[PDB]
């Protein structure tokens, strides 16, 4: 499954058992939105129970704190960031901006294989997110 990450769903997303998340920041106005989402959903199927797939509508005004927290501006999306919470917060970036199921899947495999450069996030999780 792929869930929508909003402020309303953030607790449900970080308050779970899985502590690896991939986040697709996808402007709802992007060309072929359903296409990009489908690709992300297809990729999700390969990582059930290992990586939780979530998407953020980066166009949505109430998602501004979420954007800012993960270091992104609206004009920089669509973008993917993989986050680990076991146990200091760490952010990982794909090699390419390409958002195909194959490239998202490879990103995730590379991360599991320990191939991706880590980037500590020094901000504490918002109180709201649990």
Swiss-Prot record:
Sites of N6-succinyllysine modification: 36
Modification comment: Phosphorylation of Ser-122 by FAM20C is induced by endoplasmic reticulum stress and results in a functional switch from oxidoreductase to molecular chaperone. It also promotes interaction with ERN1.
Domain of life according to the entry: Eukaryota
Residue list for modification Phosphoserine: 96, 122
Cellular compartment(s): Endoplasmic reticulum; Endoplasmic reticulum lumen; Melanosome; Cell membrane
Subunit architecture: Heterodimer; heterodimerizes with the protein microsomal triglyceride transfer MTTP. Homodimer. Monomers and homotetramers may also occur. Interacts with P4HA2, forming a heterotetramer consisting of 2 alpha subunits (P4HA2) and 2 beta (P4HB), where P4HB plays the role of a structural subunit; this tetramer catalyzes the formation of 4-hydroxyproline in collagen. Also constitutes the structural subunit of the microsomal triacylglycerol transfer protein MTTP in mammalian cells. Stabilizes both enzymes and retain them in the ER without contributing to the catalytic activity. Binds UBQLN1.
Miscellaneous comment: Reduces and may activate fusogenic properties of HIV-1 gp120 surface protein, thereby enabling HIV-1 entry into the cell.
Disease listed for this protein: Cole-Carpenter syndrome 1: A form of Cole-Carpenter syndrome, a disorder characterized by features of osteogenesis imperfecta such as bone deformities and severe bone fragility with frequent fractures, in association with craniosynostosis, ocular proptosis, hydrocephalus, growth failure and distinctive facial features. Craniofacial findings include marked frontal bossing, midface hypoplasia, and micrognathia. Despite the craniosynostosis and hydrocephalus, intellectual development is normal. CLCRP1 inheritance is autosomal dominant.
Primary role: This multifunctional protein catalyzes the formation, breakage and rearrangement of disulfide bonds. At the cell surface, seems to act as a reductase that cleaves disulfide bonds of proteins attached to the cell. May therefore cause structural modifications of exofacial proteins. Inside the cell, seems to form/rearrange disulfide bonds of nascent proteins. At high concentrations and following phosphorylation by FAM20C, functions as a chaperone that inhibits aggregation of misfolded proteins. At low concentrations, facilitates aggregation (anti-chaperone activity).
Protein family per UniProt: Belongs to the protein disulfide isomerase family.
Protein name: Protein disulfide-isomerase
């Amino acid at each position: 499954l792929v869930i929508e990450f909003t402020e309303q769903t953030a607790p449900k997303i970080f308050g779970g058992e899985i502590k690896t998340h991939i986040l697709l920041f996808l402007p709802k106005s992007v060309s072929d939105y359903d296409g990009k989402l489908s690709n992300f959903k297809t990729a999700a199927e390969s990582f059930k129970g290992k990586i939780l797939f979530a998407f953020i509508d980066s166009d949505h005004t109430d998602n501004q704190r979420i954007l800012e927290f993960f270091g992104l501006k609206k004009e920089e999306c669509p973008a993917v960031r993989l986050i680990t919470l076991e146990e200091e917060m760490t952010k990982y970036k794909p090699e390419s901006e390409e958002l195909t199921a194959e490239r998202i899947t490879e990103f995730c495999h590379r991360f599991l294989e320990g191939k991706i450069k880590p980037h500590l996030m020094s901000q504490e999780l918002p109180e709201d997110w649990d």
